[PDB]
Amino acid sequence: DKLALFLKVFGGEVLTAFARTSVTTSRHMVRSISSGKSAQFPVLGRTQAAYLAPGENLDDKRKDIKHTEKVITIDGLLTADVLIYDIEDAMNHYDVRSEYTSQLGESLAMAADGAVLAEIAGLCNVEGTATVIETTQNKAALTDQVALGKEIIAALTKARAALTKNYVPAADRVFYCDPDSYSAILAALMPNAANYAALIDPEKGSIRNVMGFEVVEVPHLTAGGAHVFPANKGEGNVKVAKDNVIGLFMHRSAVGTVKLRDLALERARRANFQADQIIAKYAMGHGGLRPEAAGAVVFK
């Protein structure tokens, strides 16, 4: 019986473990939908024209808009698991449990990221509205630090710019950068010394607001090979892949997804050549959902 309760404790440790490894939890959508193997959303758009008189009828006005609806759904399953070999599994476990929990937990998000990531750039890569931006001619020439904050930021101006005219508010948004170029390398941003209180990071792993959006990041970007994010391909009509690419721009409510049954862990004994096995599962995943606009930056 007790060996059964222990599992509940492990599950609590996990879910809680998905955070702090949390990359993107907020800053995009999600829903509790039960038994729906799929789910959908609106598209439409913001636009307006002249107005009614007691004469005629409103009906005609809606011709051009081409209202649109869009649906996505779960794909395969999503998880790894771990094969314990524990007597200790019952007890003594303060160190061991932590180790085990981390190893799946961070992994789950580490899959989760790219699935919600690269496909955005894809949405920018078909021919979202469109966007891109750069500085002069290469990263070859431009190397040295503090310039590496400069050209970037200088781009960020235009970043805030095209955030308009397609509308959407600036109220909240975030850019997921790459940890190398990360922070502007904080120099150009902060040629100040001892104040990160001034840069407002009350934990949460987040640099406070810059002009436009907000700047955080996790390592790199990849998932979908483990879609199309041709880091290898320079152009081939599609430039928004990695190599090049840049720390990212996210535009309010461009994505999210549906998860059914939340997270469930299954515990087993598979005895072929064995110790013992546990199983946790997640059914959701996605790329998708018809963003309004978006973009990235490259060097060329």
Partner 1 sequence: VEVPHLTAGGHVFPANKGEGNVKVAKDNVIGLFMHRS
**Residue 121 lies near its own copies (rule: CB under 8 A):** no
Torsion (CA) 48, 49, 53, 58 in degrees, nearest 10: -70
Please select the residue that binds its own copies; options are 211, 228, 264, 268, rule is CB under 8 A: 211
The count of residues interacting with its own copies (CB under 8 A) is 99
Q: Do the beta carbons of residue 100 and residue 81 sit within 8 Å?
A: no
Whether residue 135 contacts residue 142, with contact meaning beta carbons closer than 8 Å, is answered with yes
Does residue number 48 form part of the binding site for partner 1 (CB under 8 A)?
yes
What's the min distance (Å) between Cβ of 41 and its own copies?
5
CA-to-CA distance for 290 and 18, rounded, in angstroms? 27
Distance in angstroms (rounded) separating the CA atoms of residues 213 and 273: 52
Q: Which two tokens stand for residue 94?
A: 């303060």
Taking the C-alpha atoms of residue 270 and residue 17, their distance in angstroms, rounded to an integer, is 26
Assign residue 165 a region (left: φ > 0; alpha: ψ between -120 and 50; beta: otherwise): left
Q: Supply the minimum distance, in Å, between the C-beta of residue 150 and its own copies.
A: 7
Q: Which is nearer to its own copies, 48 or 237 (CB)?
A: 48
* Count of residues making up the chain: 300
Piece in contact with its own copies (CB under 8 A), picked from 1-9, 161-169, 240-248, 260-268: 161-169
Instruction: Figure out which of the listed residues 4, 35, 47, 236 binds its own copies, where binding follows CB under 8 A.
Output: 47
Does position 237 interact with partner 1 (CB under 8 A)? The reply is no
User: Do β-strands 277-282 and 175-177 pair in parallel, antiparallel, or remain unpaired?
Assistant: unpaired
The window from 123-131, 196-204, 233-241, 260-268 that contacts its own copies (CB under 8 A) reads 196-204
* Of the residues 4, 5, 60, 94, which one makes contact with its own copies according to CB under 8 A: 94
Return the residue of 167, 200, 220, 268 that touches partner 1, per CB under 8 A.
Answer: 167
Nearest approach in angstroms of CB 254 to partner 1 is 19
- For its own copies, give the closer residue by CB, 61 or 235: 61
Least separation, in Å, of the C-beta of 230 and its own copies?
17
Q: Is 50 in the site for partner 1 (CB under 8 A)?
A: yes
Distance CA 26, CA 216 (A): 13
DSSP state, residue 82: B
Q: Which residues of this chain interact with partner 1, rule CB under 8 A?
A: 48-50, 164-165, 167
